[PDB]
Amino acid sequence: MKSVVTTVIAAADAAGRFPSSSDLESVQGSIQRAAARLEAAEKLAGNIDAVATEAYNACIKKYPYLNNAGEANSTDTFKAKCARDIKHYLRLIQYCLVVGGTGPLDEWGIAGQREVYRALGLPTAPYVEALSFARNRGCAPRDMSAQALTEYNALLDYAINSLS
């Protein structure tokens, strides 16, 4: 699961090395940055349902054709699954803020996403619009500190990039 410490340990292990100067130095970066990303993680844990709901509502507002018979937002099951999927991405982003790396998003969200959406004829654009809405929504210090919001925005942009 990619994080600061798993990256330096994997590089140390590939070369048969004990932790050295650069390994500890890297982890000092986590000690400095954790406050910002744990602030974001706590805000997102506290308010994920509201954040996910407004992102879901944004993507359906942009693509109302999804409501037409046979389209991806057209039944109660589809509507519930779509909103669930947005919450899945935000939960994986909460996990990345806890860990300080893309590992959880890489392994549990992004890997296979394109094969799944292609196989079920789910358009990618609504997913991108939902995340893009969430990316443009936040401001500091209203929602959280500038560095907390920077961390949150970077992980949203990372998910957006994975679908683009």
Binding site: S3, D23, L24, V27, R91, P104
Partner: protein, 184 residues
């Protein structure tokens, strides 16, 4: 591999829940500097620890260096010094990560069966690991004895607290105990 934080994520994902105990994560971060001191104390003294631990195992069991002993001849002594260093390396990785995953997956998985197949004594190995466990405890607390170190004594100069990182000593000791459990 997991670290302490991705361990919390994997536990949460078993109920597809967010990680809500941010207080525990803040506690991990607040002990970050002392954790880096603990890893530095082991890595900086690893050669002294390995040679003293393997020499200790041997001074308690002289058969390891007699006919049919598993540190005889030169090739086997060298292989054993290598294994003590490898085990200590994976224990230091686990302490840096705050999680045993890397030790369990990359070092302990199939170790007993490998040693069984090679004729490497698990008893004598457990003794080498016991000594390294004691050495690690002393170096983390920055209280190595002159009696056991002589001229090789090192002081790390980490900022002292009354408990001398008792919690990190227990954690480090629990990783050495996973090695011993895996070979016992």
């Amino acid at each position: 591999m997991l670290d302490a934080f991705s361990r919390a994520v994997v536990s949460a994902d078993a109920s597809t829940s967010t990680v809500s105990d941010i207080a525990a994560l803040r506690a991990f971060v607040a002990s970050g500097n002392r954790r880096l001191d603990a890893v530095n104390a082991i890595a900086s003294n690893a050669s002294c620890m390995v040679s003293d631990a393997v020499a200790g195992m041997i001074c308690e069991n002289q058969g390891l260096i007699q006919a049919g002993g598993n540190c005889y001849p030169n090739r086997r002594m060298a292989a054993c010094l290598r294994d003590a260093e490898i085990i200590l390396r994976y224990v230091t990785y686990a302490l840096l990560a705050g999680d045993a995953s890397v030790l369990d997956d990359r070092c302990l998985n199939g170790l007993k069966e490998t040693y069984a197949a090679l004729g490497v004594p698990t008893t004598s190995t457990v003794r080498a690991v016991q000594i390294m466990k004691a050495q690690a405890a002393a170096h983390i607390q920055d209280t190595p004895s002159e009696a056991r170190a002589g001229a090789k004594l090192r002081k790390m100069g980490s900022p002292v607290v009354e408990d001398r990182c008792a919690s990190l000593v227990a954690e480090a000791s629990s990783y050495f105990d996973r090695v011993i459990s895996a070979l016992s």
